């Protein structure tokens, strides 16, 4: 019988997957439900079907998942919307990458560097019927260094959740794990109608501020934001005081400062 | 001669006054530089311009203020940034209603709140050419509650204000005060084009967001928010659940929750 299920997709879904069959189930135990967008090859990120195909590990569908009973289900970056009443199971579980409450919704290696944070998190939850909204079961807060760009903050998500799964895997089989109500208190979240990846940049903001409007868009494998429609590659703020509101282009980056007159290296693409 | 000058408005820049007479210095050796706001009339906030009156407290200009060596200089919610190369005087100081570096600019009771801080703060830092870009002397930061609005944030910064100008008066008189650069991370500001008074709510958001949304507006003295052409006095956010995405318009108030379905009461005006 299939005792538990991977939705999703990217080094989170494959390394857990592989953790699973090392430790807890074998691959007739195991069945996958990849995203959308899966094409069964590794790139920037490894391929959840491509690791199934070299593992005999079937794909079922979310309506095939609804009718297995206790079936433990883990959505590991899942890209499809689950109502829990559906679900003959209830060990319906998400990791989430944002520290719940904070950041709920969509785009989280965009929305904290736009919204001035230093740190974030992952969450692992109960998935309930509303977006990120269930009880907590687990959580790892980490910071965002400096000059990260989305695509690194991503890549500390794939990396601190695949950590919090296995950490927490053992006593999610056993059902000895607890769960906790999210605070109502310092709940955020952003749809993608609140984020435009195309935004015009603020100058008259502070050198940090500026900063995070070009690096929360540095993602290559879905954009670069561009300044003088020339795109970046990558921010630096020092301390460095060189003046309030500067902006000079170089040949290779651009010299920036905000309202508090920090210096910013844009590097260009070029 | 003049020792000090106290520049600003409101119950801050009046009781600090007051303060400095009792405690430091004859009337004959201060001055003050009232707001253009200020027509000598005590209303919601004490008139500096009609407590220089009752006191014999001489009015001076900015430009007289620059020419008199040694004086000491304070900024108390002043409305103009200063040029501090025209001032002989080195002692500029200024308090701040943020929990600086975040917050520098205007409307510091809405801004918070609007990005959903659960503190805030007041700063004493020394006068540069930047906005609110000085070195900081002291700072003291504090709860804003659930339920405050920009109006009870505002007069949380007058009073903790108040008590930091009364904490650190003598160290500064003495020249025994120290200053530390403002951090280049967590750096963050809001002019006046950032913030729109008729903010339109954004539902697609967490009941404490909604509850932000209409908070950071409520200040009777300047506005109030509106939901469905209808003025709100009062916004109230609990921790229970009444499910997602709710809105009722009863006859004297509206019942609201976001994303994650928390009990928000929004009081109609009278
Ligand atoms: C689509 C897209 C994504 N990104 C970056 C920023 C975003 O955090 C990250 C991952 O994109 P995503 O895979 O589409 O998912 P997202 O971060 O929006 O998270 C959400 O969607 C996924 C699929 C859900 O499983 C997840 N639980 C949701 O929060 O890649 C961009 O920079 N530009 C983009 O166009
Ligand atoms: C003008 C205005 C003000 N307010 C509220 C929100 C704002 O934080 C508070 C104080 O208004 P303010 O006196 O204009 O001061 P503000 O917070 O914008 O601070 C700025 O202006 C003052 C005058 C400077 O001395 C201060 N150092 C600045 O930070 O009153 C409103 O809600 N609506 C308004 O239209
Ligand atoms: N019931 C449930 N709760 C969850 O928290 C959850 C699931 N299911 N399924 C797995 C995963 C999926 N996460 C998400 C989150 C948002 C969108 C999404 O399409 N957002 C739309 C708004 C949709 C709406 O308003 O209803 C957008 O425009 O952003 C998709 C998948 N997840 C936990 O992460
Ligand atoms: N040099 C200086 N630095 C300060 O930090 C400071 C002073 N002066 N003077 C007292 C007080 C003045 N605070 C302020 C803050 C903002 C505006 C203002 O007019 N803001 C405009 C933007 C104008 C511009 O871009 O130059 C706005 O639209 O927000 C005025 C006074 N102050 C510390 O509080
Ligand atoms: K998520
Ligand atoms: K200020």
Redesign the pocket.
Same mark, same amino acid.
């Given at each position: 019988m299939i005792k538990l299920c991977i939705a999703g997709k990217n080094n989170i879904a494959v390394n857990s997957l592989e953790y699973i069959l090392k430790n807890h189930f074998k691959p007739d135990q195991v069945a996958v439900i990849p995203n959308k967008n899966d094409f069964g090859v590794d790139s920037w990120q490894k391929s959840l079907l491509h690791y199934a195909f070299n593992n005999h590990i079937k794909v079922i569908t979310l309506e095939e998942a609804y009718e297995l009973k206790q079936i433990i289900f883990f &959505?590991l970056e899942?890209?499809?919307?689950?109502?829990?009443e559906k679900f003959k199971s209830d060990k319906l579980f %998400?990791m989430?990458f944002s520290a719940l409450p904070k950041y709920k919704?969509?785009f989280t290696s965009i929305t904290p560097i736009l919204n001035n944070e230093v740190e974030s998190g992952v969450t692992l939850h109960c998935?309930? %019927?509303?977006?990120?909204?269930?009880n907590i079961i687990d959580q790892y807060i980490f910071p965002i260094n400096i000059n990260d760009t989305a695509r690194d903050l991503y890549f500390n998500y794939l990396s601190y959740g695949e950590y919090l799964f296995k950490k927490n895997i053992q006593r999610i089989i056993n059902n000895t794990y607890e769960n906790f109500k999210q605070n109502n208190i310092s709940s955020s979240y952003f &749809?993608?109608?609140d984020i435009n990846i195309n935004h015009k940049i603020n100058f008259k903001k502070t050198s940090f501020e500026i900063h995070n409007q070009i690096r929360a868009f540095i993602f290559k494998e879905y954009q670069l934001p561009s300044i003088n429609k020339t795109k970046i590659i990558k921010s630096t703020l020092t301390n460095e005081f060189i003046g309030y509101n500067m902006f000079e282009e170089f040949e290779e980056y651009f010299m920036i400062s905000g309202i508090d007159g920090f210096k910013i290296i844009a590097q260009k693409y070029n």
């Open positions: &959505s899942f890209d499809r919307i689950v109502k829990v %998400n989430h919704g969509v998935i309930d %019927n509303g977006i990120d909204t269930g &749809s993608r109608q």
